[PDB]
Amino acid sequence: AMLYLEDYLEMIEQLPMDLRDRFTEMREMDLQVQNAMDQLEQRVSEFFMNAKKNKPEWREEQMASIKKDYYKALEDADEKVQLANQIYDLVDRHLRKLDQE
Amino acid sequence: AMLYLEDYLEMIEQLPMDLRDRFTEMREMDLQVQNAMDQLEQRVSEFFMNAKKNKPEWREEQMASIKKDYYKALEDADEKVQLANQIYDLVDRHLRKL
Numbered sequence: 001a002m003l004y005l006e007d008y009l010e011m012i013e014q015l016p017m018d019l020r021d022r023f024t025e026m027r028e029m030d031l032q033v034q035n036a037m038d039q040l041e042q043r044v045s046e047f048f049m050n051a052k053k054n055k056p057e058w059r060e061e062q063m064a065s066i067k068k069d070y071y072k073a074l075e076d077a078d079e080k081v082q083l084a085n086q087i088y089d090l091v092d093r094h095l096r097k098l099d100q101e
Numbered sequence: 102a103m104l105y106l107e108d109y110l111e112m113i114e115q116l117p118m119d120l121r122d123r124f125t126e127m128r129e130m131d132l133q134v135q136n137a138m139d140q141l142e143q144r145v146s147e148f149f150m151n152a153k154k155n156k157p158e159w160r161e162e163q164m165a166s167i168k169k170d171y172y173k174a175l176e177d178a179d180e181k182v183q184l185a186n187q188i189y190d191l192v193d194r195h196l197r198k199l
Binding site: 087 | 115143182
């Protein structure tokens with residue numbers, strides 16, 4: 001409980017700001033993705049809800065917004081992908097450093 | 102107060118079955134992502150902490166486990182991605198029907 005957090009806390013501190021920052025950065029990115037998907041889900045059930053109501057040209061604005069949200073999330077996930085690559089190479093670099101030492 | 106949650110109820114219930122399940126699968130995958138990230142961080146820091154103290158073998162073992170967790174994670178992110186694409190397909194199909 002509280003002691004496991006101390007150990008968890010402990011663990012994080014022995015990690016160069018290099019890595020820790022990219023992890024929380026990935027954290028934030030994942031949060032962003034979840035949020036984008038939420039607004040998409042809402043756009044979608046409104047599509048199904050109103051639908052014929054508010055005319056059928058409502059699909060234009062709606063579907064455009066759906067595509068926008070979806071693309072946004074995709075870009076955010078591609079960004080987490082980049083960040084994980086970064087963390088990967090930064091592992092490798094700190095590694096090699098220690099090995100020839 | 103929780104009107105946000107009754108509204109989300111009515112929200113969800115407007116979706117067809119396919120779409121609902123893909124979204125809930127997605128949420129499951131998010132959780133799994135958060136755990137993979139977590140676990141990976143922990144092996145990384147622990148490996149740094151105990152890097153110099155332990156033997157070459159221990160370094161190689163921790164590194165293999167780290168690599169695991171990494172690819173692990175990476176796979177989950179792809180599945181979440183994949184789910185999002187399925188959802189978008191189902192959506193524009195439910196439009197092409199109308």
